[PDB]
Amino acid sequence: MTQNIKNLDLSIELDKKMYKKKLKVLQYEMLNAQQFLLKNKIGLILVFEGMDAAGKGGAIKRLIERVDPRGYVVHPISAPQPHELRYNYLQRFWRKLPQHGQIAVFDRSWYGRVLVERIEGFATKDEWSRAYEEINNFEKILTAGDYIIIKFWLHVSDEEQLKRFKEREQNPYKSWKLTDEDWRNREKSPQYIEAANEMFEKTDKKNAPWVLVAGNDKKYARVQVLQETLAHIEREALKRGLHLTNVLD
Ligand SMILES: Nc1ncnc2c1ncn2[C@@H]1O[C@H](COP(=O)(O)O)[C@@H](O)[C@H]1O
Ligand SMILES: Nc1ncnc2c1ncn2[C@@H]1O[C@H](COP(=O)(O)O)[C@@H](O)[C@H]1O
Ligand SMILES: [Cl-]
Numbered sequence: 001m002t003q004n005i006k007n008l009d010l011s012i013e014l015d016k017k018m019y020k021k022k023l024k025v026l027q028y029e030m031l032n033a034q035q036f037l038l039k040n041k042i043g044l045i046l047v048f049e050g051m052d053a054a055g056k057g058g059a060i061k062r063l064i065e066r067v068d069p070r071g072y073v074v075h076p077i078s079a080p081q082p083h084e085l086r087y088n089y090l091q092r093f094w095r096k097l098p099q100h101g102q103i104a105v106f107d108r109s110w111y112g113r114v115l116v117e118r119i120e121g122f123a124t125k126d127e128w129s130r131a132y133e134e135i136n137n138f139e140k141i142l143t144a145g146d147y148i149i150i151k152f153w154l155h156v157s158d159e160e161q162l163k164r165f166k167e168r169e170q171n172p173y174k175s176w177k178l179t180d181e182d183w184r185n186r187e188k189s190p191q192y193i194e195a196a197n198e199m200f201e202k203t204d205k206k207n208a209p210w211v212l213v214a215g216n217d218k219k220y221a222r223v224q225v226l227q228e229t230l231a232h233i234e235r236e237a238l239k240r241g242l243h244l245t246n247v248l249d
């Protein structure tokens with residue numbers, strides 16, 4: 001589970017002060033990576049998926065906290081509006097792609113086509129069934145050009161998610177947003193997990209990988225999201241005959 005994703009990193013868990021130092025180093029490196037991508041006119045597209053309260057929002061917050069806000073947009077993706085349904089389901093995401101050298105973060109994304117839309121029946125069986133290759137072909141158009149794509153799935157246990165739901169229910173900034181329907185959707189988690197697993201099997205590609213993040217521990221998840229983003233940027237840079245260096249100071 002969470003232990004298996006943690007057993008992929010041979011490094012140890014850190015106490016709080018050391019976590020804070022490691023986070024600060026990784027955030028400086030992410031800022032440097034952004035300036036490198038801007039200078040070399042390579043776009044970056046980061047996808048985040050996972051159940052409610054898996055920690056997508058907080059992981060994103062630490063990822064871009066020290067990045068220049070001129071160079072990124074975080075898109076919180078919800079259900080399509082009536083105007084968006086007058087086009088193909090990818091249109092609303094095509095519209096949001098960053099320029100060469102810019103960063104776009106998708107907190108939920110086009111993979112909704114094979115997740116919530118499959119689970120709730122909003123997509124027919126033909127639609128979600130053909131969407132895996134549709135999505136691979138879309139991502140491959142971009143990664144054959146001047147874009148790097150990384151997709152993150154934040155795993156969380158039912159138990160840890162329930163703990164977080166109860167925290168939110170007691171939080172003045174968050175209780176207003178937690179509804180009875182959010183609690184009822186917890187009953188659909190087995191089907192969501194099956195759908196996510198088929199998604200991994202069919203759309204985990206060498207140019208657009210799925211990274212499974214152990215989300216039960218938020219501090220570990222933030223560090224892992226940063227490390228994996230940096231590792232993949234460095235490898236794709238090398239594949240392009242570029243070497244990531246310090247371009248800040
Ligand atoms: N592509 C999508 N198709 C259908 N429902 C979606 C899609 N993306 C997100 N949703 C749902 O839209 C709602 C958005 O609410 P929130 O994200 O809390 O603003 C949630 O119930 C999501 O599960
Ligand atoms: N609408 C709700 N508001 C608050 N807690 C809920 C709600 N629905 C379910 N729960 C919680 O879900 C857990 C299981 O309850 P139940 O699903 O009713 O067996 C308990 O911890 C409940 O407090
Ligand atoms: Cl269409």
Ligand SMILES: [Cl-]
Pocket residue numbers: 171
């Ligand atoms: Cl808080």
